[PDB]
Amino acid sequence: EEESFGPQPISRLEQCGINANDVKKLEEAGFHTVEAVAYAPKKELINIKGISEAKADKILAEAAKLVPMG
């Protein structure tokens, strides 16, 4: 699978302390939440520290499989 076209409530995912995301994903700005696919593509946020699907993907993947709709 690649990217996601559904919900992106990654908040509890990385905001609660997932992988590297929490640290950089939400710190450089605050993408710890749907932000993953709202205004900028996870590839843009990660561009901060210089990551990419690294932490971003690790989330949209584990999230869509653990926080589907609700």
Side-chain angles (χ1 to χ4, degrees), residues 10-54:
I10 68 133
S11 50
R12 222 199 233 77
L13 262 306
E14 67 107 292
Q15 206 250 264
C16 202
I18 194 93
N19 206 23
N21 289 265
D22 180 292
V23 192
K24 315 313 304 204
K25 257 246 312 213
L26 88 90
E27 185 94 289
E28 24 53 90
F31 299 87
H32 45 23
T33 167
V34 54
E35 290 255 295
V37 70
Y39 313 138
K42 294 161 257 284
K43 165 129 240 165
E44 206 83 18
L45 131 56
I46 55 87
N47 187 254
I48 280 149
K49 218 282 98 82
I51 330 113
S52 165
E53 285 107 59

mmCIF file of all heavy atoms in Angstrom, residues 10-54:
data_model
loop_
_atom_site.group_PDB
_atom_site.id
_atom_site.type_symbol
_atom_site.label_atom_id
_atom_site.label_comp_id
_atom_site.label_asym_id
_atom_site.label_seq_id
_atom_site.Cartn_x
_atom_site.Cartn_y
_atom_site.Cartn_z
ATOM 1 N N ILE A 10 -3.889 10.635 12.812
ATOM 2 C CA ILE A 10 -2.611 10.088 13.320
ATOM 3 C C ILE A 10 -2.311 10.665 14.696
ATOM 4 O O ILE A 10 -1.349 10.302 15.343
ATOM 5 C CB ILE A 10 -1.555 10.525 12.304
ATOM 6 C CG1 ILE A 10 -1.368 12.042 12.369
ATOM 7 C CG2 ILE A 10 -2.008 10.131 10.896
ATOM 8 C CD1 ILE A 10 0.125 12.370 12.407
ATOM 9 N N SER A 11 -3.126 11.572 15.143
ATOM 10 C CA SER A 11 -2.886 12.183 16.478
ATOM 11 C C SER A 11 -2.501 11.105 17.499
ATOM 12 O O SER A 11 -1.345 10.935 17.828
ATOM 13 C CB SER A 11 -4.213 12.839 16.859
ATOM 14 O OG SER A 11 -5.268 11.902 16.692
ATOM 15 N N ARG A 12 -3.454 10.371 18.001
ATOM 16 C CA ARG A 12 -3.129 9.314 19.003
ATOM 17 C C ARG A 12 -1.967 8.440 18.517
ATOM 18 O O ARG A 12 -1.188 7.938 19.303
ATOM 19 C CB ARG A 12 -4.403 8.480 19.134
ATOM 20 C CG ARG A 12 -4.650 8.157 20.609
ATOM 21 C CD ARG A 12 -5.610 6.970 20.719
ATOM 22 N NE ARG A 12 -6.697 7.442 21.621
ATOM 23 C CZ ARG A 12 -7.621 8.247 21.169
ATOM 24 N NH1 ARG A 12 -7.607 8.629 19.920
ATOM 25 N NH2 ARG A 12 -8.562 8.668 21.968
ATOM 26 N N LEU A 13 -1.848 8.244 17.233
ATOM 27 C CA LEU A 13 -0.742 7.388 16.712
ATOM 28 C C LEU A 13 0.626 7.955 17.107
ATOM 29 O O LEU A 13 1.269 7.466 18.012
ATOM 30 C CB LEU A 13 -0.908 7.402 15.190
ATOM 31 C CG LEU A 13 -1.646 6.140 14.736
ATOM 32 C CD1 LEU A 13 -0.931 4.902 15.278
ATOM 33 C CD2 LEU A 13 -3.081 6.173 15.265
ATOM 34 N N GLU A 14 1.083 8.970 16.424
ATOM 35 C CA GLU A 14 2.424 9.548 16.750
ATOM 36 C C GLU A 14 2.342 10.548 17.909
ATOM 37 O O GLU A 14 3.297 10.736 18.634
ATOM 38 C CB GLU A 14 2.866 10.262 15.468
ATOM 39 C CG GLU A 14 1.950 11.454 15.194
ATOM 40 C CD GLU A 14 2.700 12.750 15.504
ATOM 41 O OE1 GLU A 14 2.973 12.987 16.667
ATOM 42 O OE2 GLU A 14 2.988 13.482 14.571
ATOM 43 N N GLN A 15 1.227 11.200 18.094
ATOM 44 C CA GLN A 15 1.138 12.185 19.209
ATOM 45 C C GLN A 15 1.267 11.464 20.551
ATOM 46 O O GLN A 15 1.780 12.005 21.510
ATOM 47 C CB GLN A 15 -0.238 12.837 19.075
ATOM 48 C CG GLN A 15 -0.214 14.231 19.705
ATOM 49 C CD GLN A 15 -1.058 14.228 20.982
ATOM 50 O OE1 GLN A 15 -2.217 14.594 20.958
ATOM 51 N NE2 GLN A 15 -0.523 13.832 22.103
ATOM 52 N N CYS A 16 0.819 10.240 20.622
ATOM 53 C CA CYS A 16 0.936 9.488 21.900
ATOM 54 C C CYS A 16 2.365 8.967 22.042
ATOM 55 O O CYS A 16 2.782 8.540 23.102
ATOM 56 C CB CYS A 16 -0.054 8.330 21.775
ATOM 57 S SG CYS A 16 -0.503 7.739 23.427
ATOM 58 N N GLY A 17 3.122 9.012 20.979
ATOM 59 C CA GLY A 17 4.530 8.536 21.044
ATOM 60 C C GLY A 17 4.713 7.300 20.162
ATOM 61 O O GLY A 17 5.024 6.230 20.646
ATOM 62 N N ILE A 18 4.550 7.431 18.870
ATOM 63 C CA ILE A 18 4.750 6.254 17.988
ATOM 64 C C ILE A 18 6.253 6.107 17.722
ATOM 65 O O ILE A 18 7.056 6.134 18.634
ATOM 66 C CB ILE A 18 3.950 6.553 16.699
ATOM 67 C CG1 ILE A 18 3.816 5.269 15.875
ATOM 68 C CG2 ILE A 18 4.648 7.633 15.858
ATOM 69 C CD1 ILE A 18 2.510 4.561 16.239
ATOM 70 N N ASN A 19 6.644 5.960 16.497
ATOM 71 C CA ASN A 19 8.095 5.821 16.183
ATOM 72 C C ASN A 19 8.771 7.199 16.173
ATOM 73 O O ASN A 19 8.483 8.047 16.993
ATOM 74 C CB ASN A 19 8.136 5.194 14.790
ATOM 75 C CG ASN A 19 9.444 4.419 14.618
ATOM 76 O OD1 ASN A 19 10.061 4.021 15.586
ATOM 77 N ND2 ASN A 19 9.897 4.187 13.417
ATOM 78 N N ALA A 20 9.670 7.426 15.252
ATOM 79 C CA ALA A 20 10.364 8.747 15.189
ATOM 80 C C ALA A 20 9.356 9.870 14.972
ATOM 81 O O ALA A 20 9.570 10.998 15.367
ATOM 82 C CB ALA A 20 11.289 8.655 13.976
ATOM 83 N N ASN A 21 8.267 9.571 14.323
ATOM 84 C CA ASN A 21 7.247 10.618 14.049
ATOM 85 C C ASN A 21 7.072 11.545 15.239
ATOM 86 O O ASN A 21 7.534 12.667 15.213
ATOM 87 C CB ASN A 21 5.945 9.871 13.792
ATOM 88 C CG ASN A 21 6.016 9.150 12.446
ATOM 89 O OD1 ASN A 21 5.565 9.667 11.443
ATOM 90 N ND2 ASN A 21 6.562 7.965 12.382
ATOM 91 N N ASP A 22 6.378 11.100 16.256
ATOM 92 C CA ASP A 22 6.132 11.967 17.447
ATOM 93 C C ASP A 22 7.245 13.001 17.593
ATOM 94 O O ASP A 22 7.016 14.194 17.548
ATOM 95 C CB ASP A 22 6.127 11.012 18.640
ATOM 96 C CG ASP A 22 5.873 11.801 19.925
ATOM 97 O OD1 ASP A 22 6.741 12.571 20.304
ATOM 98 O OD2 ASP A 22 4.817 11.624 20.507
ATOM 99 N N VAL A 23 8.450 12.541 17.734
ATOM 100 C CA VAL A 23 9.599 13.471 17.869
ATOM 101 C C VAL A 23 9.598 14.530 16.763
ATOM 102 O O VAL A 23 9.382 15.695 17.009
ATOM 103 C CB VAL A 23 10.848 12.594 17.738
ATOM 104 C CG1 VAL A 23 12.076 13.400 18.160
ATOM 105 C CG2 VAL A 23 10.717 11.366 18.644
ATOM 106 N N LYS A 24 9.877 14.145 15.553
ATOM 107 C CA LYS A 24 9.946 15.156 14.459
ATOM 108 C C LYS A 24 8.592 15.413 13.792
ATOM 109 O O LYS A 24 8.227 16.542 13.549
ATOM 110 C CB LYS A 24 10.930 14.562 13.449
ATOM 111 C CG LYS A 24 12.153 14.005 14.182
ATOM 112 C CD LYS A 24 12.646 15.028 15.206
ATOM 113 C CE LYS A 24 12.926 16.359 14.504
ATOM 114 N NZ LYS A 24 13.919 17.048 15.375
ATOM 115 N N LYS A 25 7.857 14.393 13.460
ATOM 116 C CA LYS A 25 6.563 14.629 12.764
ATOM 117 C C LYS A 25 5.754 15.733 13.450
ATOM 118 O O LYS A 25 5.321 16.672 12.818
ATOM 119 C CB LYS A 25 5.812 13.305 12.807
ATOM 120 C CG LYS A 25 5.915 12.623 11.441
ATOM 121 C CD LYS A 25 4.531 12.547 10.796
ATOM 122 C CE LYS A 25 3.525 12.002 11.809
ATOM 123 N NZ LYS A 25 2.553 11.218 11.000
ATOM 124 N N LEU A 26 5.515 15.619 14.727
ATOM 125 C CA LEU A 26 4.691 16.662 15.413
ATOM 126 C C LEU A 26 5.525 17.842 15.947
ATOM 127 O O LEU A 26 4.986 18.891 16.243
ATOM 128 C CB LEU A 26 4.016 15.917 16.569
ATOM 129 C CG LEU A 26 4.921 15.932 17.807
ATOM 130 C CD1 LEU A 26 4.608 17.164 18.657
ATOM 131 C CD2 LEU A 26 4.680 14.669 18.633
ATOM 132 N N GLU A 27 6.807 17.685 16.134
ATOM 133 C CA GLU A 27 7.593 18.813 16.716
ATOM 134 C C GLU A 27 7.890 19.932 15.710
ATOM 135 O O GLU A 27 7.439 21.047 15.883
ATOM 136 C CB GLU A 27 8.884 18.177 17.219
ATOM 137 C CG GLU A 27 9.727 19.220 17.951
ATOM 138 C CD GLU A 27 9.428 19.150 19.449
ATOM 139 O OE1 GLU A 27 8.338 19.542 19.834
ATOM 140 O OE2 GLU A 27 10.291 18.703 20.186
ATOM 141 N N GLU A 28 8.666 19.673 14.685
ATOM 142 C CA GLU A 28 8.995 20.774 13.716
ATOM 143 C C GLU A 28 7.770 21.659 13.454
ATOM 144 O O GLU A 28 7.898 22.821 13.124
ATOM 145 C CB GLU A 28 9.478 20.125 12.405
ATOM 146 C CG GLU A 28 8.947 18.699 12.240
ATOM 147 C CD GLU A 28 7.423 18.678 12.392
ATOM 148 O OE1 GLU A 28 6.750 18.843 11.389
ATOM 149 O OE2 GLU A 28 6.954 18.490 13.502
ATOM 150 N N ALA A 29 6.587 21.132 13.611
ATOM 151 C CA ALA A 29 5.369 21.961 13.382
ATOM 152 C C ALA A 29 4.219 21.454 14.254
ATOM 153 O O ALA A 29 3.808 22.104 15.195
ATOM 154 C CB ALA A 29 5.032 21.785 11.905
ATOM 155 N N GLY A 30 3.699 20.297 13.951
ATOM 156 C CA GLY A 30 2.578 19.752 14.768
ATOM 157 C C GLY A 30 1.693 18.837 13.915
ATOM 158 O O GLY A 30 0.492 18.787 14.093
ATOM 159 N N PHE A 31 2.267 18.110 12.990
ATOM 160 C CA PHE A 31 1.427 17.200 12.132
ATOM 161 C C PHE A 31 0.837 16.031 12.932
ATOM 162 O O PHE A 31 0.244 15.137 12.365
ATOM 163 C CB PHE A 31 2.371 16.653 11.068
ATOM 164 C CG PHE A 31 2.900 17.799 10.265
ATOM 165 C CD1 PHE A 31 4.031 18.468 10.708
ATOM 166 C CD2 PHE A 31 2.251 18.209 9.096
ATOM 167 C CE1 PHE A 31 4.526 19.544 9.998
ATOM 168 C CE2 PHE A 31 2.750 19.295 8.371
ATOM 169 C CZ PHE A 31 3.892 19.967 8.824
ATOM 170 N N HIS A 32 1.001 16.010 14.227
ATOM 171 C CA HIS A 32 0.444 14.873 15.028
ATOM 172 C C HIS A 32 -1.084 14.818 14.926
ATOM 173 O O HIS A 32 -1.783 14.974 15.907
ATOM 174 C CB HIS A 32 0.866 15.150 16.472
ATOM 175 C CG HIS A 32 0.619 16.597 16.813
ATOM 176 N ND1 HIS A 32 -0.311 17.373 16.136
ATOM 177 C CD2 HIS A 32 1.171 17.419 17.764
ATOM 178 C CE1 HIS A 32 -0.291 18.600 16.685
ATOM 179 N NE2 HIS A 32 0.595 18.684 17.681
ATOM 180 N N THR A 33 -1.605 14.586 13.750
ATOM 181 C CA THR A 33 -3.086 14.512 13.581
ATOM 182 C C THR A 33 -3.444 14.446 12.094
ATOM 183 O O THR A 33 -2.582 14.417 11.239
ATOM 184 C CB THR A 33 -3.638 15.804 14.195
ATOM 185 O OG1 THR A 33 -4.998 15.958 13.815
ATOM 186 C CG2 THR A 33 -2.832 17.007 13.696
ATOM 187 N N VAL A 34 -4.715 14.427 11.791
ATOM 188 C CA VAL A 34 -5.169 14.373 10.365
ATOM 189 C C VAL A 34 -4.236 15.178 9.449
ATOM 190 O O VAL A 34 -4.109 14.883 8.278
ATOM 191 C CB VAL A 34 -6.564 14.994 10.378
ATOM 192 C CG1 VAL A 34 -6.500 16.381 11.019
ATOM 193 C CG2 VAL A 34 -7.078 15.117 8.942
ATOM 194 N N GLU A 35 -3.588 16.188 9.972
ATOM 195 C CA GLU A 35 -2.661 17.012 9.138
ATOM 196 C C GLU A 35 -1.917 16.142 8.118
ATOM 197 O O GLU A 35 -1.548 16.597 7.053
ATOM 198 C CB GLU A 35 -1.670 17.612 10.136
ATOM 199 C CG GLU A 35 -2.381 18.652 11.002
ATOM 200 C CD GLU A 35 -1.969 20.057 10.554
ATOM 201 O OE1 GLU A 35 -0.801 20.381 10.689
ATOM 202 O OE2 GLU A 35 -2.829 20.782 10.083
ATOM 203 N N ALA A 36 -1.690 14.897 8.436
ATOM 204 C CA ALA A 36 -0.967 14.003 7.487
ATOM 205 C C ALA A 36 -1.469 14.222 6.056
ATOM 206 O O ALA A 36 -0.692 14.335 5.128
ATOM 207 C CB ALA A 36 -1.287 12.585 7.960
ATOM 208 N N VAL A 37 -2.759 14.281 5.866
ATOM 209 C CA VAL A 37 -3.296 14.489 4.489
ATOM 210 C C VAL A 37 -4.348 15.602 4.487
ATOM 211 O O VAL A 37 -5.477 15.403 4.085
ATOM 212 C CB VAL A 37 -3.923 13.151 4.101
ATOM 213 C CG1 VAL A 37 -5.189 12.915 4.926
ATOM 214 C CG2 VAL A 37 -4.280 13.170 2.612
ATOM 215 N N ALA A 38 -3.985 16.776 4.928
ATOM 216 C CA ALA A 38 -4.963 17.902 4.946
ATOM 217 C C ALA A 38 -4.479 19.033 4.035
ATOM 218 O O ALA A 38 -5.126 19.386 3.069
ATOM 219 C CB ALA A 38 -5.006 18.366 6.401
ATOM 220 N N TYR A 39 -3.344 19.604 4.334
ATOM 221 C CA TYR A 39 -2.820 20.711 3.485
ATOM 222 C C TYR A 39 -1.518 20.285 2.802
ATOM 223 O O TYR A 39 -1.351 20.443 1.609
ATOM 224 C CB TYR A 39 -2.563 21.866 4.453
ATOM 225 C CG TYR A 39 -3.760 22.046 5.355
ATOM 226 C CD1 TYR A 39 -3.577 22.299 6.719
ATOM 227 C CD2 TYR A 39 -5.054 21.962 4.826
ATOM 228 C CE1 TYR A 39 -4.687 22.468 7.556
ATOM 229 C CE2 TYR A 39 -6.164 22.130 5.662
ATOM 230 C CZ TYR A 39 -5.980 22.383 7.027
ATOM 231 O OH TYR A 39 -7.076 22.549 7.850
ATOM 232 N N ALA A 40 -0.592 19.748 3.550
ATOM 233 C CA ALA A 40 0.699 19.315 2.941
ATOM 234 C C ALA A 40 0.825 17.792 2.983
ATOM 235 O O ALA A 40 0.384 17.156 3.920
ATOM 236 C CB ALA A 40 1.781 19.965 3.806
ATOM 237 N N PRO A 41 1.432 17.258 1.959
ATOM 238 C CA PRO A 41 1.632 15.791 1.866
ATOM 239 C C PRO A 41 2.699 15.339 2.861
ATOM 240 O O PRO A 41 3.698 16.002 3.058
ATOM 241 C CB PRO A 41 2.097 15.582 0.427
ATOM 242 C CG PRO A 41 2.700 16.889 0.022
ATOM 243 C CD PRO A 41 1.986 17.965 0.799
ATOM 244 N N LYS A 42 2.496 14.217 3.492
ATOM 245 C CA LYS A 42 3.499 13.724 4.475
ATOM 246 C C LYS A 42 4.912 13.903 3.915
ATOM 247 O O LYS A 42 5.867 14.070 4.648
ATOM 248 C CB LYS A 42 3.179 12.241 4.658
ATOM 249 C CG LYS A 42 1.813 12.092 5.330
ATOM 250 C CD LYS A 42 1.283 10.674 5.105
ATOM 251 C CE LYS A 42 0.217 10.693 4.008
ATOM 252 N NZ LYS A 42 -0.993 11.269 4.660
ATOM 253 N N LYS A 43 5.049 13.874 2.619
ATOM 254 C CA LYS A 43 6.399 14.044 2.004
ATOM 255 C C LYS A 43 6.905 15.473 2.226
ATOM 256 O O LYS A 43 8.091 15.741 2.218
ATOM 257 C CB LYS A 43 6.182 13.776 0.515
ATOM 258 C CG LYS A 43 7.393 14.266 -0.279
ATOM 259 C CD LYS A 43 7.873 13.152 -1.210
ATOM 260 C CE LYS A 43 9.321 12.790 -0.873
ATOM 261 N NZ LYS A 43 9.565 11.490 -1.556
ATOM 262 N N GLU A 44 6.008 16.390 2.434
ATOM 263 C CA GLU A 44 6.418 17.806 2.658
ATOM 264 C C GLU A 44 6.795 18.010 4.120
ATOM 265 O O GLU A 44 7.839 18.541 4.430
ATOM 266 C CB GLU A 44 5.190 18.637 2.291
ATOM 267 C CG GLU A 44 5.627 20.038 1.861
ATOM 268 C CD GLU A 44 6.039 20.016 0.388
ATOM 269 O OE1 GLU A 44 5.662 19.081 -0.299
ATOM 270 O OE2 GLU A 44 6.727 20.935 -0.029
ATOM 271 N N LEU A 45 5.969 17.580 5.024
ATOM 272 C CA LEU A 45 6.322 17.745 6.454
ATOM 273 C C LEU A 45 7.670 17.063 6.694
ATOM 274 O O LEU A 45 8.627 17.680 7.120
ATOM 275 C CB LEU A 45 5.172 17.068 7.228
ATOM 276 C CG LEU A 45 5.701 16.105 8.305
ATOM 277 C CD1 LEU A 45 6.652 16.842 9.259
ATOM 278 C CD2 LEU A 45 4.520 15.550 9.104
ATOM 279 N N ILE A 46 7.745 15.790 6.426
ATOM 280 C CA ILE A 46 9.019 15.057 6.640
ATOM 281 C C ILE A 46 10.174 15.855 6.059
ATOM 282 O O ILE A 46 11.264 15.870 6.598
ATOM 283 C CB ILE A 46 8.844 13.748 5.894
ATOM 284 C CG1 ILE A 46 8.477 14.052 4.439
ATOM 285 C CG2 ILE A 46 7.732 12.935 6.561
ATOM 286 C CD1 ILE A 46 9.762 14.231 3.619
ATOM 287 N N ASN A 47 9.950 16.539 4.970
ATOM 288 C CA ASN A 47 11.049 17.348 4.385
ATOM 289 C C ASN A 47 11.690 18.212 5.476
ATOM 290 O O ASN A 47 12.773 18.735 5.296
ATOM 291 C CB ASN A 47 10.396 18.232 3.322
ATOM 292 C CG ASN A 47 11.480 18.978 2.542
ATOM 293 O OD1 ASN A 47 11.674 20.163 2.731
ATOM 294 N ND2 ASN A 47 12.200 18.332 1.665
ATOM 295 N N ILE A 48 11.050 18.370 6.613
ATOM 296 C CA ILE A 48 11.676 19.201 7.676
ATOM 297 C C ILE A 48 13.034 18.617 8.042
ATOM 298 O O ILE A 48 14.045 18.952 7.457
ATOM 299 C CB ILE A 48 10.704 19.149 8.857
ATOM 300 C CG1 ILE A 48 9.554 20.127 8.601
ATOM 301 C CG2 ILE A 48 11.428 19.553 10.144
ATOM 302 C CD1 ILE A 48 8.281 19.606 9.262
ATOM 303 N N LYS A 49 13.063 17.742 8.993
ATOM 304 C CA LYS A 49 14.359 17.124 9.388
ATOM 305 C C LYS A 49 14.999 16.462 8.166
ATOM 306 O O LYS A 49 16.193 16.251 8.115
ATOM 307 C CB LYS A 49 14.010 16.080 10.449
ATOM 308 C CG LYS A 49 15.099 16.067 11.524
ATOM 309 C CD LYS A 49 16.320 15.301 11.007
ATOM 310 C CE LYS A 49 17.357 16.290 10.470
ATOM 311 N NZ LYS A 49 18.092 16.771 11.673
ATOM 312 N N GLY A 50 14.207 16.142 7.176
ATOM 313 C CA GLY A 50 14.766 15.505 5.952
ATOM 314 C C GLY A 50 14.274 14.058 5.839
ATOM 315 O O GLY A 50 14.850 13.259 5.130
ATOM 316 N N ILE A 51 13.221 13.707 6.530
ATOM 317 C CA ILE A 51 12.721 12.307 6.445
ATOM 318 C C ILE A 51 11.856 12.119 5.193
ATOM 319 O O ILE A 51 12.153 12.627 4.132
ATOM 320 C CB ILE A 51 11.866 12.068 7.699
ATOM 321 C CG1 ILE A 51 12.357 12.895 8.892
ATOM 322 C CG2 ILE A 51 11.943 10.591 8.062
ATOM 323 C CD1 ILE A 51 11.308 13.949 9.258
ATOM 324 N N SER A 52 10.788 11.377 5.330
ATOM 325 C CA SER A 52 9.864 11.107 4.195
ATOM 326 C C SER A 52 8.926 9.988 4.635
ATOM 327 O O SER A 52 8.433 9.989 5.749
ATOM 328 C CB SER A 52 10.761 10.653 3.041
ATOM 329 O OG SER A 52 9.962 10.053 2.030
ATOM 330 N N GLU A 53 8.700 9.011 3.809
ATOM 331 C CA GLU A 53 7.824 7.894 4.241
ATOM 332 C C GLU A 53 8.395 7.290 5.529
ATOM 333 O O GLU A 53 7.725 6.573 6.245
ATOM 334 C CB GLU A 53 7.874 6.880 3.099
ATOM 335 C CG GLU A 53 7.022 7.385 1.933
ATOM 336 C CD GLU A 53 7.935 7.860 0.801
ATOM 337 O OE1 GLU A 53 8.709 7.054 0.312
ATOM 338 O OE2 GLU A 53 7.843 9.022 0.441
ATOM 339 N N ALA A 54 9.640 7.578 5.822
ATOM 340 C CA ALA A 54 10.271 7.026 7.053
ATOM 341 C C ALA A 54 9.291 7.055 8.225
ATOM 342 O O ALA A 54 8.664 6.064 8.556
ATOM 343 C CB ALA A 54 11.457 7.946 7.329
#
